[PDB]
Short mmCIF file of C-alpha atoms in Angstrom, two decimals:
data_model
loop_
_atom_site.label_atom_id
_atom_site.label_comp_id
_atom_site.label_asym_id
_atom_site.label_seq_id
_atom_site.Cartn_x
_atom_site.Cartn_y
_atom_site.Cartn_z
CA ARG A 1 133.27 131.68 60.88
CA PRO A 2 130.27 134.72 61.06
CA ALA A 3 131.21 136.89 64.73
CA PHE A 4 127.46 136.01 65.34
CA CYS A 5 128.20 132.42 66.09
CA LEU A 6 130.77 133.82 69.11
CA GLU A 7 128.48 135.61 70.95
CA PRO A 8 126.06 134.46 73.93
CA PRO A 9 121.98 133.43 73.56
CA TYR A 10 120.24 136.69 73.52
CA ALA A 11 116.95 134.61 75.40
CA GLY A 12 115.75 138.73 74.80
CA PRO A 13 112.46 140.37 76.78
CA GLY A 14 109.45 138.26 75.06
CA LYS A 15 107.41 135.84 77.88
CA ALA A 16 107.45 132.99 75.54
CA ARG A 17 109.38 129.95 76.57
CA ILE A 18 110.66 128.91 73.38
CA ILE A 19 113.35 125.36 72.67
CA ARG A 20 116.33 127.05 70.64
CA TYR A 21 119.64 125.99 70.08
CA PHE A 22 122.88 128.25 70.04
CA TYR A 23 126.66 127.69 69.00
CA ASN A 24 128.56 127.37 71.53
CA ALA A 25 131.95 128.32 70.84
CA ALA A 26 133.80 127.62 73.63
CA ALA A 27 132.98 124.46 73.44
CA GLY A 28 132.02 123.86 69.69
CA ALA A 29 128.92 122.63 70.36
CA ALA A 30 125.19 123.37 69.99
CA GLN A 31 123.56 123.90 73.25
CA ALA A 32 119.66 124.01 73.56
CA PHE A 33 118.30 127.79 75.28
CA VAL A 34 115.11 129.58 76.27
CA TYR A 35 113.77 132.21 73.51
CA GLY A 36 111.27 134.47 74.74
CA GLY A 37 110.06 134.81 71.30
CA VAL A 38 111.15 138.99 70.80
CA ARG A 39 114.08 140.40 69.05
CA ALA A 40 116.34 137.34 68.21
CA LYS A 41 119.99 137.53 67.72
CA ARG A 42 121.83 135.52 64.78
CA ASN A 43 123.34 133.11 67.46
CA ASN A 44 119.62 131.48 67.63
CA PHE A 45 118.85 128.13 65.16
CA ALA A 46 115.38 125.28 65.18
CA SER A 47 117.70 122.58 65.69
CA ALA A 48 120.97 121.67 66.92
CA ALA A 49 121.85 121.02 63.21
CA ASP A 50 121.36 123.95 62.02
CA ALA A 51 122.94 125.14 64.65
CA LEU A 52 126.28 123.85 63.70
CA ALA A 53 125.69 124.10 60.10
CA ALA A 54 125.80 127.57 59.73
CA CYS A 55 128.79 128.12 62.83
CA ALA A 56 130.47 124.77 62.78
CA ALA A 57 132.99 125.51 60.30
CA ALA A 58 136.24 127.81 60.62
#
């Protein structure tokens, strides 16, 4: 599993209010968060489906 999958969501310093998803490794589940539109890190997906697709596998 990529290391980035275990990192917490990163909102960043942007002013936008974009709904994105992160893989919550603690829970083994995709979870929504608010992304500001700048300086996204890798645990940041357009959908719950894509978050699981990328990060669910061991």
